[PDB]
């Protein structure tokens, strides 16, 4: 099946805070994905590919931050655009979308 | 109109990335920096800053490398933030144009 789908949601800025990036997923001509988890339960999935997608040109910047917050389990607020739906993870209790931003959360800055 | 403000004795406490609204060709590398010794209520202790990254030129600009290193080591640094303000997490953030590490009390009063 196609792990890429155009459901057709409008351009909007969504987010999920206090999450930690684990359970990555890579394919060859596909996305850099990561399951974001809060308090032991998965919240949302995000992906980033420099071959296909609208947000392609930022992959080179996102890959170097996600890796960081994967090497150390820092708490982050991730941002997501729901233009596109991703079915990369199998038997997922959550839906995967496109990664369009990561903020290393600061409670004083009202992020987490 | 906001102009160049030079902020001294400041440590990067948060780093972020987001797309630029006007064009997909650029993107904002933003962050939150806090003074040393300032009160939690002071606005100098929660400054949001941003600068552009050009996506047509692959690589990591001189600002990105230094921002990552100074965030990692938590070192005070003087920043030229301004003059433009760009949106970030729902608030204006001053554009970053130059930033140099602190050496002592002579250059960072």
């Amino acid at each position: 099946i196609t792990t890429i789908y155009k459901t057709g949601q409008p351009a909007a800025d969504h987010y999920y805070s206090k999450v930690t990036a684990t359970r990555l997923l890579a394919s060859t001509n596909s996305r850099l994905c990561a399951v974001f988890v809060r308090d032991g339960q998965s919240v949302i999935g995000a992906c980033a590919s420099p071959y296909e997608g609208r947000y392609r040109d930022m992959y080179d910047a996102l890959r170097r931050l996600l890796y960081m917050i994967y090497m150390s389990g820092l708490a982050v607020r991730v941002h997501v655009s729901k233009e596109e739906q991703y079915y990369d993870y199998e038997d997922a209790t959550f839906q995967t979308y496109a990664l369009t931003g990561i903020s290393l959360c600061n409670p004083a800055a009202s992020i987490c | 109109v906001p102009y160049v403000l030079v902020k001294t004795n400041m440590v990067v406490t948060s780093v972020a990335m987001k797309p630029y609204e006007v064009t997909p060709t650029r993107m904002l590398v933003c962050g939150i920096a806090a003074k040393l010794g300032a009160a939690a209520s002071s606005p100098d202790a929660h400054v949001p800053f941003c600068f552009g990254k050009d996506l047509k030129r692959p690589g990591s600009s001189p600002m990105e490398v230094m921002l990552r290193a100074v965030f990692m080591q938590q070192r005070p640094l003087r920043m030229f933030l301004g003059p433009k303000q760009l949106t970030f997490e729902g608030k204006p953030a001053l554009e970053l144009i130059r930033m140099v590490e602190c050496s002592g009390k002579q250059d960072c009063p």
Partner: antibody, heavy 128, light 113 residues
Framework: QITLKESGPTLVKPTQTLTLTCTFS????????????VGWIRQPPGKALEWLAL???????RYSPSLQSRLTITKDTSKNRVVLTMINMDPVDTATYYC??????????????????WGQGTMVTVSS | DIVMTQSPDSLAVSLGERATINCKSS????????????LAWYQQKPGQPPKLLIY???TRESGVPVRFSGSGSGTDFTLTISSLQAEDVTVYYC?????????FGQGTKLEIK
């Protein structure tokens, strides 16, 4: 610093349609900024506070079940103005009409948060 | 369609006596995702619009003096002014924001003895 506006009439006749506009001053109702919505709350003199309608940043309008198909809510996004119009006014619809800005959630984007900042009120008197 | 209910519509108060204003609900207001039960408390001085005092059951709003505290769970909540002054004798509303027909309470009018 977020501050709304009221800018409306005070003598709307019955069966007509009123107009109340908020011109906010420091939050963005933009699709590319998340969480922020605008809500409407009235207060009949003496009675309690009921919630009329809420416009979301990604243009998902949420209406009060009872007076749903009598209310419209729109925004001008770039022009910081959100207008509320309700048809078929009735002199039991006397109220002080505030609009408040709903803070973006601190744990999600599709979540609930309180109306931390409210505007002020018109004094729609639906007389005759 | 969560009907929300506020205890005494009229509460006698002495200047310093710990006010206990409790508020019930038809259903729960507790969200599994954030592990907080979505309740807020609003002040209302004569004429002035509502000002938030407490949200997230107990999480006080920035700028609210440290007297107003919240407690409770599931379907029973309490706002407690541990110290009362001349201005906190006003109309208080408990609002839910779990699902989105948004509901308030009748209101509690703190008078003096």
């Amino acid at each position: 610093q977020i501050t709304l506006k009221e800018s409306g009439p005070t003598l709307v006749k019955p069966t007509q349609t009123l107009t109340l506009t908020c011109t906010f001053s420091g939050f963005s109702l933009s699709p590319d900024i998340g969480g922020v919505g605008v809500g409407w709350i009235r207060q009949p003199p003496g009675k309690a506070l009921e919630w009329l309608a809420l416009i979301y940043w990604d243009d998902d309008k949420r209406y009060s079940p009872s007076l749903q198909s009598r209310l419209t809510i729109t925004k001008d996004t770039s022009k910081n103005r959100v207008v509320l119009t309700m048809i078929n006014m009735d002199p039991v619809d006397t109220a002080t009409y505030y609009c408040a800005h709903r803070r973006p959630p601190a744990y999600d984007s599709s979540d609930g948060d309180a109306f931390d900042i409210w505007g002020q009120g018109t004094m729609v008197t639906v007389s005759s | 369609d969560i009907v929300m209910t506020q205890s005494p519509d009229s509460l006698a108060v002495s200047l310093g006596e710990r006010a206990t204003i409790n508020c019930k609900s038809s259903q729960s207001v507790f969200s599994s995702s954030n592990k907080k039960n979505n309740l807020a408390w609003y002040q209302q001085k004569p004429g002035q619009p509502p000002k938030l005092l407490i949200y997230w059951a107990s999480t006080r709003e920035s700028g609210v003096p440290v007297r107003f505290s919240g407690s409770g769970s599931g379907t029973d909540f309490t706002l407690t002014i541990s110290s009362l002054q001349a201005e906190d004798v006003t109309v208080y509303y408990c609002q839910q924001y779990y699902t989105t027909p948004y509901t308030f309470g009748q209101g509690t009018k703190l008078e003096i003895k």
